[PDB]
Design a protein around this nucleic acid. Structure first.
Ligand SMILES: [Mg+2]
Ligand SMILES: [Mg+2]
Lengths: 57, 1107
DNA sequence: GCATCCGTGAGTCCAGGG
DNA sequence: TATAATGGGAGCTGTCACGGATGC
């Protein structure tokens, strides 16, 4: 049952969520990269906030 | 030649300006011609007045705006992919309240797109049309509760995104609820907040029996307005602190803030008319002297109770009546996006008013510019302009959508919104609408219809006073129309007096037989019931509506031809369509022609001034059809005002010329016109009938790379001199060269990506001792199936009044023209909805032909008529036969046109011309004609005993002739309908549609073939194609479709190799998209395992993904 | 248990895209 | 790096059947 809670979140291989330069050198990328970056920023800020003993709120 | 016209209805008024719905709407929104101080508080002026002042201290206030001149004219905007637009300035002043200091400046806000003369826009080079939207009018409505048969819902509806929808209901427990933002609370509370006492509510509502009792709640009346207000703010904002000034602010912004709530002028007028009250402004309540004052709520409740009880003069509303649906035109749609951009700008202003130590410093225009751009490029009402032919553009500007932002979602639109309501009469065409899932949701304005200042569609009627028809015409909304008895336009008149005892009329749509005394108004014309396209179908009264719809719609798709003709049977609207769509140049005043060129006409007017008119020549439309103007005058000719100076596309001497008049036989022909296919004569190609000019645009960029620069050059590695033969010194193909698929239009080289050559390449280099070059060939080539003659090059290179997006050094564009002859697979159509693809082009000696040796041009199958019921095309053909021999054309107005007897008279005259010619030239009746007369006698078509000539004449008056088979010389065994028909060639050309692929590009993620001819794409073998293969048990065919032919990477490589070696294709393996599915499920925290029969994992990733 | 009041996912095929 | 500054804005509208969830 407890496996329905995540501890390690998996990360899809990068060719399934590419970052590609189209004709003209401009760049296109999957939305999943932004969803992951949000997750990673929030997690890293949580690890830091825990290190400084931030108030519970 | 001579034009004879039919019919007895004289139109009192001409059609109005047919694009005024675009032009006047936008002029109203911009008020660009109006001195600033005279402007009304409408359009962008009203946007400014809603945004400003911007307070909190500092204050930034609006004085006026100004529109300057466009930096670039229209042609230059099309050429350089610019937006045709005008700079917007605003005069603003910053006042500090305590200092009294006042700083004033004119700040630049960006650019606003300008409407061109014909009613369209030029957004980034491409012509666009803002399509008008239809929606439910704001106002106060009463509707049956679909659950409770004797109860009614009241609905207060403001302008879109200008307030919430409020509903009032009588609950089964008897209390009268109000719903806003999905919150069912008792209305008594809000009534208390407004300042109503139980005394006033008793005396104002008690008349309607027990209903008022469900409104009496003492726990509410026991509280002053402040305590009720705080109570409402709590049950509306759970968890929000019930602060007093915050509750005032919220309810004021919900019900009383004009900058947030707006019924609009239309919702104001209709709420006033419905509830029988007067409104101060356009909101449900006001804030006056520290308290809320009611405007609408009590009158609405009054009406709702009166309707529930049954008291007379209270009725439910028909929400599809065109008194309750209104048109949002371009001016209003744009003003709304302008208002959103201005709101974002004001938020930025308040932001910088907090953080800081000038009007310009406070104003960042970007959000505004972003919103306008977003409206004019990515909106669903902002549409790539259809200018296949000039009628296309005109029709596009008059379209009406029930979709778009703030409208309906298809797949959900029910039968009611798609219906033709009785009130559509004279307002919205009942035939012209799409055949797909959008049917009934996109429509066309009726020919005489006009959108009034509130947005309701009005139609014109003539006044009738005691049986006399006046020339007073009155434009009415459907609400006003419903008051009167209105006679039909074919009512017989002697002078101006109704010359009939019984008159067909309408009362509220209902047909009714009526005396002249009772007639109040009379239609202007049958024309007013239909769209412009539908008004171009002769004999419309003989065509079932379903096929009339197709003929309507397909006129839009007619290609402009190099020898276009106007129809031999016209309706009489062809000149006005050419005029209103700017498909021709006309004389501005009386004058004399001084100069005439392929390029320009110079005219000397009465004023003595010498006006020069440049002619647009072989220009490219949005659809690649050719826009060119051809002069139709000569030096020295005397012209009056309005006379034709030049024909545009699909114009013949100022008449709409959407196709050709061809000689047609109606008969089967050896299977080649089976199931709507069409047989034509090679003669048509020989004389360039149905030949059209098409222009394609190709574009290439040279950019800076991290690897070195792309160069547009002739020095392309490994190409012969034959491959470069027609490339100019700089590597651009020369004007006039013929280019075929594969040929280079623009030479370009790109530096190679850093690659260590495979050992096989190292060895092959050593064997030939040739240094691999450093750049590779990346030229622009003519794609498969295209080509023609190069007619223009444009060359924009940086460092030259030219600046491109960052990193591109030069852009080159090449224009290529083709002359397109009619070919097998091209689509032809007539105005009655007969449509077909050319299946066979016969040499002339195979064509059915008349006794005098004249072959016919096209052979249409009779099996296309009975179930289609579009007999107008048969009458057209009959009259065409007459016109053929009399050298004349006809105007036969819709529902007022040529009748069978007049067509028979004309056929008798034409017979005398067709047959007396023979009788003079020294010939009698042919033996084959006698055999066909024998058969005709048995068919009942000719009177037995008459002479050959008299029987031939009977046949001719039935529109039939003896016809010889060109292959045999023997006659067709019955006489055949033959005549002239107007047939168009549509913009569905097989040249553009044919496409094949062996291999080609694959998608990034799925590794499946790309879609699209331009991507050299593959065909979709979808779910249903798979079902078909499964149902045949074609297991290997299907497995190929799913693996070797799509995204089995090793499979596709190995199958290509095996075929080019002559071996058999190998066994497929796993498709890549299943690997993708497994990885995407692993990202969802699911372990998806392929097992073998012993339940042991099988690795489909061949170890490459296991540590 | 017995109704009502909710969320939610669904809607033929192709084409091109501005 | 030091005057003092202490709780946000946005909504948004013409579908429908159905499985599960809340009030009676
Ligand atoms: Mg369609
Ligand atoms: Mg469509």
């Amino acid at each position: 049952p407890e496996w329905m809670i995540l501890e390690a979140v998996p990360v899809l291989p990068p060719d399934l969520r590419p970052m590609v330069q189209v004709d003209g050198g401009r760049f296109a990328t999957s939305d999943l990269n932004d969803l992951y970056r949000r997750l990673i920023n929030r997690n890293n800020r949580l690890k830091k906030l825990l290190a400084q003993g931030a108030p519970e709120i | 030649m001579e034009i004879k016209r039919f019919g007895r209805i004289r139109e009192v008024i001409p059609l109005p300006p047919l694009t005024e719905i675009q032009v006047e709407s936008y002029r109203r929104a911009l008020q660009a011609d109006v001195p600033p101080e005279k402007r009304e508080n409408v359009g962008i002026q009203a946007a400014f007045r809603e945004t400003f002042p911007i307070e909190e201290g500092l204050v930034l206030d609006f004085l006026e705006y100004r529109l300057g001149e466009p930096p670039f004219p229209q042609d230059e905007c099309r050429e350089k992919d610019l937006t045709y637009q005008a700079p917007l300035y605003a005069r603003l002043q910053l006042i500090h309240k305590d200092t009294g200091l006042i700083k004033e400046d004119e700040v630049f806000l960006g650019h606003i797109p300008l409407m061109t003369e014909d009613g369209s826009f030029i957004i980034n080079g491409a012509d666009r049309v803002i399509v008008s939207q239809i929606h439910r009018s704001p106002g106060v409505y009463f509707t049956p509760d679909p659950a409770r048969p004797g109860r009614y819902i009241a609905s207060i509806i403001p302008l879109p995104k200008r307030g919430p929808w409020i509903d009032l209901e009588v609950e089964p427990n008897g209390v009268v609820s109000m719903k806003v933002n999905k919150r069912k609370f008792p209305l008594v509370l809000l009534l208390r907040v407004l300042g109503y006492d139980q005394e006033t509510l008793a005396r104002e509502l008690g008349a309607y029996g027990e209903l008022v009792q469900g409104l009496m709640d003492e726990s509410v009346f026991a509280m002053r307005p402040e305590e009720a207000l705080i109570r409402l703010f709590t049950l509306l904002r759970p968890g929000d602190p019930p602060k007093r000034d915050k509750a005032v602010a919220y309810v004021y912004g919900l019900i009383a803030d004009p900058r947030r709530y707006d019924l609009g002028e239309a919702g104001r007028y209709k709420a006033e008319e419905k509830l029988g009250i007067r409104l101060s402004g356009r909101t449900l309540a006001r804030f006056e002297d520290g308290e809320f004052k009611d405007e609408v709520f009590l009158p609405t409740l009054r009406y709702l109770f009166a309707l529930t009880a049954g008291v007379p003069g209270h009725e439910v509303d028909d929400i599809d009546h065109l008194g309750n649906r209104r048109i949002r035109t371009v001016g209003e749609l744009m003003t709304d996006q302008f208002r959103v951009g201005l709101a974002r700008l004001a938020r930025g202003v308040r932001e910088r008013m907090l953080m800081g130590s000038t009007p310009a410093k406070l104003v960042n225009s970007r959000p505004l510019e972003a919103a306008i751009r977003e409206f004019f490029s990515r909106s669903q009402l902002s549409q790539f302009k259809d200018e296949t032919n000039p009628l296309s553009s005109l029709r596009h500007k008059r379209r009406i959508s029930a979709l778009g932002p703030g409208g309906l979602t298809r797949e959900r639109a029910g039968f009611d919104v798609r219906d033709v309501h009785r009130t559509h009469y004279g307002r919205i065409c009942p035939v012209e609408t799409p055949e797909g899932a959008n049917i009934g949701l996109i429509t066309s304005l009726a020919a005489y219809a006009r959108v009034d200042e509130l947005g309701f569609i009005r139609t014109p009627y003539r006044r009738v006073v005691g049986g006399v028809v006046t020339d007073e015409v009155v434009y009415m909304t459907a609400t006003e129309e419903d008051r009167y008895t209105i006679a039909q336009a074919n009512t017989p008149l002697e002078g101006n007096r109704i010359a009939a005892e019984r008159v067909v009329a309408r009362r509220k749509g209902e047909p009714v037989i009526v005396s002249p005394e009772e007639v109040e108004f009379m239609d202007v014309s049958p024309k007013q019931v239909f769209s412009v396209n539908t008004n171009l179908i002769p004999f419309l009264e003989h065509d079932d509506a379903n096929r009339a719809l197709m003929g309507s719609n397909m006129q839009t798709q007619a290609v402009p031809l190099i020898r276009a003709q106007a129809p031999v049977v016209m309706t009489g609207l062809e000149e006005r369509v050419v005029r209103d769509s700017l498909a021709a140049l006309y004389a501005e005043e009386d004058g004399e022609v001084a100069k005439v060129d392929g390029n320009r006409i110079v005219v000397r007017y009465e004023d003595g001034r010498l006006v020069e008119y440049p002619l647009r020549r072989f220009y490219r439309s949005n659809q690649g059809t050719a826009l060119d103007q051809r002069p139709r005058v000569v030096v020295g000719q005397r012209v009056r005002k309005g006379d034709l100076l030049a024909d545009g596309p699909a114009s013949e001497n100022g008449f709409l010329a959407l196709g050709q008049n061809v000689l047609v036989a109606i008969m089967p022909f050896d299977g080649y016109n089976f199931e709507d296919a069409i047989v034509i004569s090679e003669e048509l190609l020989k004389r360039d009938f149905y030949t059209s000019i098409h222009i394609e645009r190709y574009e290439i960029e040279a950019r800076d790379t991290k690897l070195g620069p792309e160069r547009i050059t002739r020095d392309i590695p490994h190409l012969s001199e034959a491959a470069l033969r027609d490339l100019d010194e700089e590597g651009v193909v020369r004007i006039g060269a013929e280019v075929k698929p594969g040929d280079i239009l623009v030479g370009r080289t790109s530096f190679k990506g850093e690659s260590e050559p495979t050992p096989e390449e190292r060895l092959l280099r050593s064997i030939f001792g040739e240094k691999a070059r450093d750049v590779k060939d990346t030229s622009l080539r003519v794609p498969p199936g295209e080509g023609g003659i190069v007619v223009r090059t444009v060359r924009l290179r940086r460092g030259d009044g030219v600046e491109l997006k960052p990193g591109v050094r030069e852009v080159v564009r090449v224009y290529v023209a083709q002359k397109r002859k009619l070919q097998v697979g091209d689509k032809l159509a007539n105005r009655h909805g007969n449509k077909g693809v050319v299946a066979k082009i016969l040499p002339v000696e195979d064509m059915p032909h008349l006794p005098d040796g004249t072959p016919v041009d096209v052979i249409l199958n009779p099996l296309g008529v009975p179930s289609r019921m579009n007999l107008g095309q048969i009458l057209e053909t009959h009259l065409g036969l007459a016109g053929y021999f009399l050298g004349q054309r006809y105007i036969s107005p819709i529902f007022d046109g040529a009748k069978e007897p007049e067509i028979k008279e004309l056929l008798a005259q034409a017979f005398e011309v067709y047959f007396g010619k023979r009788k003079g030239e020294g010939f009698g009746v042919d033996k084959r004609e006698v055999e066909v007369l024998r058969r005709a006698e048995k068919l009942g078509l000719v009177t037995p005993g008459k002479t050959p000539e008299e029987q031939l004449k009977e046949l001719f008056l039935q529109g039939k002739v003896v016809l010889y088979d060109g292959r045999t010389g023997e006659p067709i065994e019955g006489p055949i309908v033959v005549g002239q028909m107007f047939i168009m060639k549509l913009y569905h050309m097989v040249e553009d549609k044919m496409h094949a692929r062996s291999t080609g590009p694959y998608s990034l993620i799925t590794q499946q073939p790309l879609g699209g001819k331009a991507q050299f794409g593959g065909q979709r073998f979808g779910e249903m194609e798979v079902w078909a293969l499964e149902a045949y048990g074609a297991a290997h065919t299907l497995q190929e479709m799913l693996t070797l032919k799509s995204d089995d990477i090793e499979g596709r490589n190995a199958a290509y190799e095996a075929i080019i070696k002559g071996e058999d294709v190998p066994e497929p393996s796993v498709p890549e998209s299943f690997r993708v599915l497994v990885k995407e499920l692993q990202a969802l925290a699911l372990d998806v395992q392929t097992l073998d029969e012993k339940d042991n994992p099988v690795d489909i990733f061949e170890g490459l993904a296991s540590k």
